[PDB]
Write a protein that binds this ligand. Structure first.
Ligand SMILES: COc1nn(C)cc1C(=O)N[S@@]1(=O)=NC(=O)c2ccc3c(c2)N(C[C@@H]2CCO[C@H]2[C@@H](OC)/C(F)=C/C[C@H](C)C1)C[C@@]1(CCCc2cc(Cl)ccc21)CO3
Ligand SMILES: OC[C@H]1O[C@H](O[C@H]2[C@H](O)[C@@H](O)[C@@H](O)O[C@@H]2CO)[C@H](O)[C@@H](O)[C@@H]1O
Length: 518
């Protein structure tokens, strides 16, 4: 749990130009004597927050911007402070993708959007609609080909179809996200995912198709179409398939709406090499020659660097990428994106395999996606009304009946725990000696140790929240009322992170209300 001084370790995904990046690393070493190690570990976006939390991991992490808000909220990223001269060399909308709570948390590299990639030797004209793909597959099957193969294991690739007829992650209106408004189990999302499951039912696609199987089938000329990003174009070039990159097909007359990613470079908060990392990213990578080295290995898409994007913009494959991006939406970077992606990943795999119906799969994804927000509403309200003696008059909002009935249940069963276990609560309160916001930050570790490692049931969840209320009452009494919302956020994090799968299996807080129905 200590990063080594006087070198740079970089993590980037195995689908990106990591050999090109290593070439930029060699140029840095030639000037500075500092070795640059580029690694592409499996699941690096899940590994980074685990290793970084212990003061370990790479100096620089590359991922799409959507994961970076979670990393920033967890204190895992150094604030990026480039001068005006450097900032003005990149597109302002790319800087917006890496801004979190008013602070830049990464360097933007390139804009990524999925396109429809088609074999001009099999399909001279690509289909304008999803609805015509079954008929095309039937024509191509008669010739020993298939219409379409793409990765069905990552919701990134299926999302554009789910979003087409009105599926959404977090509602965006008046230039602001309603994190309370999730659109995963609406009629639009159901129509999109039913269309995908029907393609599998009718044997136009196979539920087991992943990135490697789709790429091999397209690059060998066995399938007429794939869905992929700019990074894929290198392997297609090598294959000598006569390919086009175009607009994704429409669904029910509406565009497919890909979630747009900005490949971004974050600096580990635990790195002792932050000045070397800034130098590397600003004066080696984010140059015409640095981006060219990476782009020549695996294409980046529409680069953040204006000078180089002017050259690449002339490429009709980049025009197609930006057309799809404009029909799509820039991903949020809110910490909840991780849970959203896990919930929709499971829904698509289960619907595609027949493990769940579309209705069952998207219900669970909806419950999973709103679990943090709903849990925080209940827990924050209970802690604050316990501390002050007065309830919150603010409307409950989305799924408000559940929130109201959960808080009602918690008042009954939680007050019971605090009354019956007053001596134990007082003993643990004094032993923990909670005085201020720094001490509250130390509770997460002991909550995971005591709560998360014990049996999972609603009773032990009531104790977790009820002791939280007991601590909140103390914090109010000693003029530390400012600590209660952070405490509520910390309890919610432990509960929903460590009991995610169990909570969704219970129908979340509806399960809680039913379990303690007297
Ligand atoms: C029929 O049975 C029941 N019906 N219902 C409604 C409940 C039970 C029931 O039996 N529940 S029980 O099994 N629950 C536990 O054991 C338990 C569960 C979660 C806990 C947790 C304990 N904690 C240790 C406790 C605190 C007081 O002394 C501890 C314990 O004695 C050593 C005790 F009193 C247990 C009695 C429980 C009622 C038994 C607190 C904890 C660690 C410390 C830091 C910290 C900070 C915050 Cl903000 C928030 C929480 C925490 C983690 O959360
Ligand atoms: O499938 C969910 C997944 O989608 C995005 O990941 C993309 C990434 O943006 C691309 O650069 C490329 O590597 O493919 C990935 C999909 O396999 C999100 O960025 C990611 O957080 C999310 O889990």
């Amino acid at each position: 749990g200590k990063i080594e001084e006087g070198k740079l370790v970089i993590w980037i995904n195995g689908d990106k130009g990591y050999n090109g990046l290593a070439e930029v690393g060699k140029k840095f070493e030639k000037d500075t004597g500092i070795k640059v190690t580029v690694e592409h570990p499996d699941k690096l976006e899940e590994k980074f927050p685990q290793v970084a939390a212990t003061g370990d991991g790479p100096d620089i992490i590359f991922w799409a911007h959507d994961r970076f808000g979670g990393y920033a909220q967890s204190g895992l990223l150094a604030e990026i402070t480039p001068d005006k001269a450097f900032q003005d060399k990149l597109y302002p909308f790319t800087w917006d993708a890496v801004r979190y709570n008013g602070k830049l948390i990464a360097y933007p590299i390139a804009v990524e959007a999925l396109s429809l990639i088609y074999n001009k030797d099999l399909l001279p004209n690509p289909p304008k609609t999803w609805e015509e793909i079954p008929a095309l597959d039937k024509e191509l099957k008669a010739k020993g080909k298939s219409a379409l193969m793409f990765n069905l294991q990552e919701p990134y690739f299926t999302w554009p179809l789910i979003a087409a007829d009105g599926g959404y992650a977090f509602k965006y209106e008046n230039g602001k996200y309603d994190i309370k408004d999730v659109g995963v189990d609406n009629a639009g999302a159901k129509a999109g995912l039913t269309f995908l499951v029907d393609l599998i039912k009718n044997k136009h696609m196979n539920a087991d198709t992943d990135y490697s199987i789709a790429e091999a089938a397209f690059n060998k000329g066995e399938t007429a179409m794939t869905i992929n990003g700019p990074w894929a174009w290198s392997n297609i070039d090598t294959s000598k398939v006569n390919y086009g990159v175009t607009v994704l097909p429409t669904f029910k007359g509406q565009p497919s709406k890909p979630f747009v990613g900005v490949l971004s470079a974050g600096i580990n908060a635990a790195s002792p090499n932050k000045e070397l990392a800034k130098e590397f990213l600003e004066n080696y990578l984010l140059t015409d020659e640095g981006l060219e080295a990476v782009n020549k290995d695996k294409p980046l898409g529409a680069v953040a660097l204006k000078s180089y994007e002017e050259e690449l913009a002339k490429d009709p494959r980049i025009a197609a990428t930006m057309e799809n991006a404009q029909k799509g939406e820039i991903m949020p970077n809110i910490p909840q994106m991780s849970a959203f992606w896990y919930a929709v990943r499971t829904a698509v795999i289960n619907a595609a395999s027949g493990r769940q119906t579309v209705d069952e799969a998207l219900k669970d994804a909806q419950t999973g996606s709103e679990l943090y927000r709903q849990s925080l509403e209940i827990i924050s309200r209970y802690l604050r009304e316990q501390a002050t003696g007065a309830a919150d008059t603010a409307p409950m909002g989305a799924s408000g009946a559940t929130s109201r009935k959960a808080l009602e249940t918690l008042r009954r069963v939680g007050d019971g725990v605090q009354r019956n276990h007053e001596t134990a609560f007082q003993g643990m309160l004094r032993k923990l000696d909670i005085k201020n916001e720094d001490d509250v930050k130390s509770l997460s570790r002991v909550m995971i140790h005591v709560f998360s490692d014990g049996v999972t049931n609603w009773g032990r969840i009531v104790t977790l929240i009820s002791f939280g209320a007991f601590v909140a009452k103390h914090l109010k009494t000693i003029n530390q009322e400012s600590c209660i919302e952070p405490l509520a956020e910390s309890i919610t994090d432990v509960l929903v992170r460590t009991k995610r799968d169990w909570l969704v299996k219970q129908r979340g807080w509806d399960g809680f209300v039913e379990f303690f129905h007297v």
